Write an enzyme that holds these catalytic residues in place. Structure first.
Site, PDB file in Angstrom:
ATOM      1  N   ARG A  54      36.472  45.357  45.247  1.00  0.00           N
ATOM      2  CA  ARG A  54      37.573  44.752  44.427  1.00  0.00           C
ATOM      3  C   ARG A  54      38.199  43.957  45.362  1.00  0.00           C
ATOM      4  O   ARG A  54      38.544  44.242  46.716  1.00  0.00           O
ATOM      5  CB  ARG A  54      38.545  45.382  43.918  1.00  0.00           C
ATOM      6  CG  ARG A  54      40.228  45.034  42.775  1.00  0.00           C
ATOM      7  CD  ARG A  54      40.635  45.785  42.579  1.00  0.00           C
ATOM      8  NE  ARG A  54      41.328  45.392  41.499  1.00  0.00           N
ATOM      9  CZ  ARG A  54      42.653  45.018  41.267  1.00  0.00           C
ATOM     10  NH1 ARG A  54      43.261  45.631  42.904  1.00  0.00           N
ATOM     11  NH2 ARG A  54      43.301  44.648  40.382  1.00  0.00           N
ATOM     12  N   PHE A  59      45.730  38.426  48.206  1.00  0.00           N
ATOM     13  CA  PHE A  59      46.143  39.623  47.587  1.00  0.00           C
ATOM     14  C   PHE A  59      45.636  40.848  48.427  1.00  0.00           C
ATOM     15  O   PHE A  59      46.567  40.891  49.409  1.00  0.00           O
ATOM     16  CB  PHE A  59      46.079  39.387  46.138  1.00  0.00           C
ATOM     17  CG  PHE A  59      46.806  41.010  45.832  1.00  0.00           C
ATOM     18  CD1 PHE A  59      47.796  42.072  46.709  1.00  0.00           C
ATOM     19  CD2 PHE A  59      46.331  42.113  44.827  1.00  0.00           C
ATOM     20  CE1 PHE A  59      47.889  43.150  46.179  1.00  0.00           C
ATOM     21  CE2 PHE A  59      46.396  43.624  44.309  1.00  0.00           C
ATOM     22  CZ  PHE A  59      48.100  43.413  44.899  1.00  0.00           C
ATOM     23  N   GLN A  62      39.737  45.767  49.159  1.00  0.00           N
ATOM     24  CA  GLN A  62      39.782  47.012  48.517  1.00  0.00           C
ATOM     25  C   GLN A  62      38.155  47.596  48.766  1.00  0.00           C
ATOM     26  O   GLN A  62      37.243  47.708  48.139  1.00  0.00           O
ATOM     27  CB  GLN A  62      40.556  47.681  47.287  1.00  0.00           C
ATOM     28  CG  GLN A  62      40.854  48.992  46.868  1.00  0.00           C
ATOM     29  CD  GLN A  62      41.084  49.192  45.634  1.00  0.00           C
ATOM     30  OE1 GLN A  62      41.860  48.248  44.488  1.00  0.00           O
ATOM     31  NE2 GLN A  62      41.077  50.586  44.890  1.00  0.00           N
ATOM     32  N   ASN A 101      45.081  54.656  45.814  1.00  0.00           N
ATOM     33  CA  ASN A 101      45.789  55.639  45.333  1.00  0.00           C
ATOM     34  C   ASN A 101      46.244  56.046  43.703  1.00  0.00           C
ATOM     35  O   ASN A 101      46.175  54.179  43.419  1.00  0.00           O
ATOM     36  CB  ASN A 101      47.317  56.790  45.820  1.00  0.00           C
ATOM     37  CG  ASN A 101      48.416  55.826  45.888  1.00  0.00           C
ATOM     38  OD1 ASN A 101      48.998  54.805  44.680  1.00  0.00           O
ATOM     39  ND2 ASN A 101      49.165  54.988  46.753  1.00  0.00           N
ATOM     40  N   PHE A 112      42.783  49.431  51.504  1.00  0.00           N
ATOM     41  CA  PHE A 112      42.739  48.158  51.527  1.00  0.00           C
ATOM     42  C   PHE A 112      43.273  47.706  52.359  1.00  0.00           C
ATOM     43  O   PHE A 112      44.372  48.010  53.458  1.00  0.00           O
ATOM     44  CB  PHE A 112      43.334  47.632  49.741  1.00  0.00           C
ATOM     45  CG  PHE A 112      45.103  48.259  49.774  1.00  0.00           C
ATOM     46  CD1 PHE A 112      45.441  49.351  49.294  1.00  0.00           C
ATOM     47  CD2 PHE A 112      45.990  46.946  49.676  1.00  0.00           C
ATOM     48  CE1 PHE A 112      46.611  49.725  48.958  1.00  0.00           C
ATOM     49  CE2 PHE A 112      47.112  47.593  49.684  1.00  0.00           C
ATOM     50  CZ  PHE A 112      47.501  48.366  49.834  1.00  0.00           C
ATOM     51  N   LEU A 121      53.935  46.799  47.719  1.00  0.00           N
ATOM     52  CA  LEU A 121      53.536  48.056  47.838  1.00  0.00           C
ATOM     53  C   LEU A 121      54.854  49.222  48.681  1.00  0.00           C
ATOM     54  O   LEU A 121      54.376  50.524  49.192  1.00  0.00           O
ATOM     55  CB  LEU A 121      52.799  48.073  48.174  1.00  0.00           C
ATOM     56  CG  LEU A 121      51.113  47.518  46.915  1.00  0.00           C
ATOM     57  CD1 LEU A 121      50.436  47.231  47.859  1.00  0.00           C
ATOM     58  CD2 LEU A 121      51.549  48.139  45.592  1.00  0.00           C
ATOM     59  N   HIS A 125      52.307  53.322  48.897  1.00  0.00           N
ATOM     60  CA  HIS A 125      50.965  52.644  49.515  1.00  0.00           C
ATOM     61  C   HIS A 125      51.223  53.645  51.149  1.00  0.00           C
ATOM     62  O   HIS A 125      52.184  53.407  52.080  1.00  0.00           O
ATOM     63  CB  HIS A 125      50.330  52.013  49.277  1.00  0.00           C
ATOM     64  CG  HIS A 125      49.837  52.152  47.545  1.00  0.00           C
ATOM     65  ND1 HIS A 125      48.604  52.254  47.382  1.00  0.00           N
ATOM     66  CD2 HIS A 125      50.667  51.311  46.453  1.00  0.00           C
ATOM     67  CE1 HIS A 125      48.650  52.385  45.996  1.00  0.00           C
ATOM     68  NE2 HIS A 125      50.152  51.516  45.429  1.00  0.00           N
TER      69      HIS A 125
END
Length: 163
Positions: A54, A59, A62, A101, A112, A121, A125
């Site tokens: 991903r 952004f 991942q 997660n 990521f 986040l 995370h």
């Protein structure tokens, strides 16, 4: 003192370049050790040969799902899941390395690399490292992503280990 690990990245099997990371073992030792050991493969499984499934430009990238290759798998060196160690460090900008997660205390192997500041986040995370060298290679990877995260070419970790 903090360990450095590398990923050699390939695009449809063709070398792209090397990314290295610093792992903040001084602040998140349990989480850093998981990533370090998955990068060397020393426990018999790990990141070598796995893909970035991903990638959303502007952004994140991942990866780390070395069992199912799509975001539904992976596991830690401590078992399927492990706890959120602490939230000392924050998502301050490009290059931050953070754990993916599926809820509180569900860390596995997925991670990521942020390519933007992602402050929403923070506290959810665990941040555990940063890109040291090769942020330019992350920027090149990002170009193979898309809005929904599908990659237009296969992005793999062709080799990895500790420097």
């Amino acid at each position: 003192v903090n360990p450095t690990v590398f990923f050699d990245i390939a695009v449809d099997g063709e070398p792209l370049g090397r990314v290295s990371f610093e792992l903040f073992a001084d602040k998140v030792p349990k989480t850093a050790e998981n990533f370090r050991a998955l990068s060397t493969g020393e426990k018999g499984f790990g990141y070598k040969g796995s893909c970035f499934h991903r990638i959303i430009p502007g952004f994140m990238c991942q990866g780390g799902d070395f069992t199912r290759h799509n975001g539904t798998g992976g596991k830690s060196i401590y078992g399927e899941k492990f706890e959120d160690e602490n939230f000392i460090l924050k998502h301050t900008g490009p290059g931050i390395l953070s754990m993916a997660n599926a809820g509180p205390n569900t860390n596995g192997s997925q991670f990521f690399i942020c390519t933007a500041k992602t402050e929403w986040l923070d506290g959810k995370h665990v941040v555990f490292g940063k890109v040291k060298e090769g942020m330019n290679i992350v920027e090149a990877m990002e170009r193979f992503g898309s809005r929904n995260g599908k990659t237009s070419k296969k992005i793999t970790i062709a080799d990895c280990g500790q420097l």
